[PDB]
Design a protein around this ligand. Sequence first.
Ligand code: FDA
Ligand code: FDA
Lengths: 503, 503
Amino acid sequence: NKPIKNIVIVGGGTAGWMAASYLVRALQQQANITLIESAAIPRIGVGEATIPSLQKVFFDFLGIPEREWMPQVNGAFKAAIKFVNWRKSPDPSRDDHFYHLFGNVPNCDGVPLTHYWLRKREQGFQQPMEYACYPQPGALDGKLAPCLSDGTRQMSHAWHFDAHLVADFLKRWAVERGVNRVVDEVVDVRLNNRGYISNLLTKEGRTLEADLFIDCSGMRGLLINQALKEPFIDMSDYLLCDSAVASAVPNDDARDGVEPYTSSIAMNSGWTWKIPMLGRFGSGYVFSSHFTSRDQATADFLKLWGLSDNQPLNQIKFRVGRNKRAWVNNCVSIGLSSCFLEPLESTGIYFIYAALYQLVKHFPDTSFDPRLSDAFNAEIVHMFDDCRDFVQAHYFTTSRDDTPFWLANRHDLRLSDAIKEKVQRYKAGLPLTTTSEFFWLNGNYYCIFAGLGMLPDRSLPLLQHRPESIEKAEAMFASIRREAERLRTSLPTNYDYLRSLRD
Amino acid sequence: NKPIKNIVIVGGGTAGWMAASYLVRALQQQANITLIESAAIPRIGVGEATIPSLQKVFFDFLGIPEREWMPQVNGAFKAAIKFVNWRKSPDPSRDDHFYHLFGNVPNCDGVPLTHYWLRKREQGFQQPMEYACYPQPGALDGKLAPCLSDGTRQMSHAWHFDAHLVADFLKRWAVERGVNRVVDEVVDVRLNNRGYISNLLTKEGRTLEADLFIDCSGMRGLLINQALKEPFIDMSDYLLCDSAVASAVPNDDARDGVEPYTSSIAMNSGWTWKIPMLGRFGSGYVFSSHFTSRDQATADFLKLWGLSDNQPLNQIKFRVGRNKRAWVNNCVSIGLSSCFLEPLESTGIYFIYAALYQLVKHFPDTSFDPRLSDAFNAEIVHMFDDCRDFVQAHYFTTSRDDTPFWLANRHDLRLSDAIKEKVQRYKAGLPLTTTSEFFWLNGNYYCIFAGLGMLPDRSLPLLQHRPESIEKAEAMFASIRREAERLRTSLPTNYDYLRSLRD
Ligand SMILES: Cc1cc2c(cc1C)N(C[C@H](O)[C@H](O)[C@H](O)COP(=O)(O)OP(=O)(O)OC[C@H]1O[C@@H](n3cnc4c(N)ncnc43)[C@H](O)[C@@H]1O)c1[nH]c(=O)[nH]c(=O)c1N2
Ligand SMILES: Cc1cc2c(cc1C)N(C[C@H](O)[C@H](O)[C@H](O)COP(=O)(O)OP(=O)(O)OC[C@H]1O[C@@H](n3cnc4c(N)ncnc43)[C@H](O)[C@@H]1O)c1[nH]c(=O)[nH]c(=O)c1N2
């Protein structure tokens, strides 16, 4: 069976160039890659915060270290997501914030630290879960960097970057290693009787042909949805947000610093992201068209940052779900042409590079062994499904009841059987998945659940039997405090740290 | 023009019930008052120390004497604020305390006693300003009451009271005289095209209507800020504190006594109040989120009183400023829905009752004469502005430089032109405002300035010319010493005094 030799990618957004660079890297020989991108159809000018796997899976795979791509994409550090007003009905006079931090929680004698903490909360300990279990939340509060000045790593971190530049950086990178860039628009797609893709017909006259097609076309799914007719499984019964109003905002870095984290500020009918980088931050009120008009959400979005009705904006509509199948025949969808959830925990870019890893792990020849396509499709489903559990979990555990949208999340959602079982295990008091990557651990469910004020019914029956164990955990809590303390006096601010990679 | 007949107050905190009782008292006829208070939204469980005007303006207006409301609100006496460690970089082996006392300082031959004192400090007198100029600081040191046992008044005093009870005492008082209490929550507010308030829609179904609306809704400013869209002028450029961590603490009254004063203990990134009453005292580390994390300030707050990490706390966020306008259209804001500074000299409750006095002084009919609204707004601005001068003055005169927060106060503040001119007049050696209520006199600026160790450049050129005058002041200093002395052997302790109003 002839190998796959000519590859066409449709689209030059983030999904498009990640595919070109990844595929140009994985396919060391017999590979010919063309990416076509309509300059009439712009990129979705967002997608800016990330999870730690980006370096390990994407950039390391390319052979580009953090210090090389960060400066060139206005890169900044994300140590966590800070959740603001998700817990109770909001109150200006109350401090309703929790972090969701990266990195694992230690175990004491085979039981995670979260669980020794809860036994303490049961005796009237007051300190919230994350401040007790992780060394860094206080640092983030003080806007500290995740490294010492000299560059040594002091916490787990992910990144915030400018979406446009990220695309340009990889465009330069890819073209350079022989990727062939075509600026044209695809208008017709031709199938054969069997139902495969023989050719793309472009606006400027070109007929495009290849063994293999990557649909990186955005939510229009030009190849996968339209041409190939593959169903999109709508999932608004699971998660309600379907729209966003976004923009960049000036930051006075020199006086307010630059937060080393993403914020998610709960609103009336959605929530708003804050993604700081040097000079500015990206922000977006992700909302639900069912519960608020787009014009009302604009008003809320401007009201929240004191913007002016003169401020240019990015008005966005999004589809929530996954194609029945990510890869059909000789077409594979990567990015928004495939499955989205909502930006709440940055699972998007992750769906891109994780899919490309799976694509290469399942790479076909021209016979198109459907056993490879099936295996691939199943991994996409599981990755997507897992993520959906976790995002969904931010919503149905809420105590807020002050708006129709918060009522619905609390009440009206369709919940997988898998998220119900996890919730019920947490409610009985059992740790979730711990460790000593295929992903969301006890520590993650715990920050989220504990942050929204749904705690387990009790601490572990087992603990009554292991008093020494309890003591050892006391010591581990004591180290953590020491570490938190050292960091306070040792990290440079995030503003100052970033400022020196070249200003 | 029809008179105002139906009045709705939103909120049943301290601001809420002071308004109901004051308005039910002022409006002897044609007045119908309803107060709505969400049992889902609690009172800010603080606001406990006061200035002398409370009786004269608020309680006297109601016809309630001191001996009637004190016992019923765990009332205690405040003779001054004692400032601890504000002067130098702290030292356990040094006694860094000054009082700010109530009451005026006498004048000798038209020049205040503070100024004869300074001429003496210039010859190497050592006794600090307040111990020389006021008869009572030594009494307070010995925790003495401000009255003889039989009840005769021996100094100027204000009060400490339990916030919750104060609200309940006036709730009982008001309802009783025909105030109509509604336990519901306001969720929607309806305007007309002109921009007035036609109705409040509640959670339980009620549509509320009235000629006149008092926003006593807390910092959420439900009517004034949210519905009516009135701007809040943020003033963090003037004063930096924006948060507090508070709690009640057990006092062994029988052995440590009960201080007849508020303390303000300067911290790393704020300062802490102590408000003793029988059995217990209220305490709060007011701090700045910019300079310390909330979790660090908790640690400092527990470390300072030896509390346990089991101790329930009141975690508070506050906004510093004033609405562009306190009263817009047919809405008037009283209390935290209007302007706050920070608890440093108890200007808060004072803003409530002073505003209510001004409201009645400017009371409208249904035509809503904007000349009345304007006049009112201007008095609020002037009262608020005056207070802000005085609080701000505690901060920028500091000599401390041992933390970033003390550095900023010393350096980074925006200072009104009015406080600069007062400072410059004090620096030249001129008395500030003296007397023989619309408020902060020479004696007040003097305790504060002199306490922090910023003294004038010299004594008054005039004094070189009036040696007899100097002598007469010597005698006045001699009386004061006699009085201080008599008091030492005549006042009962504050514990013993309070103990008998009914135990
Ligand atoms: C509101 C919001 C917020 C976020 C996110 C999404 C949304 C909707 N994401 C997801 C992220 O934005 C997304 O995964 C990528 O940045 C962009 O993916 P694409 O390239 O699929 O789409 P996109 O729609 O950007 O690009 C489409 C490309 O296809 C081309 N094209 C389309 N039709 C064509 C045709 N007919 N012919 C030729 N070319 C054609 C266009 O020219 C363009 O080059 C995210 N993820 C994450 O991990 N963290 C985050 O914080 C966020 N934030
Ligand atoms: C940390 C700190 C410390 C101090 C002080 C403030 C702060 C922040 N103060 C100020 C003082 O606490 C304050 O002025 C009053 O005690 C409380 O004022 P309110 O009633 O505005 O607010 P508060 O927020 O207490 O009460 C709000 C009321 O509004 C109601 N409400 C809100 N929204 C509603 C809705 N939508 N529907 C129905 N009801 C609604 C609530 O149910 C509640 O009844 C003070 N002052 C002073 O003079 N000396 C001092 O020592 C101090 N100490």
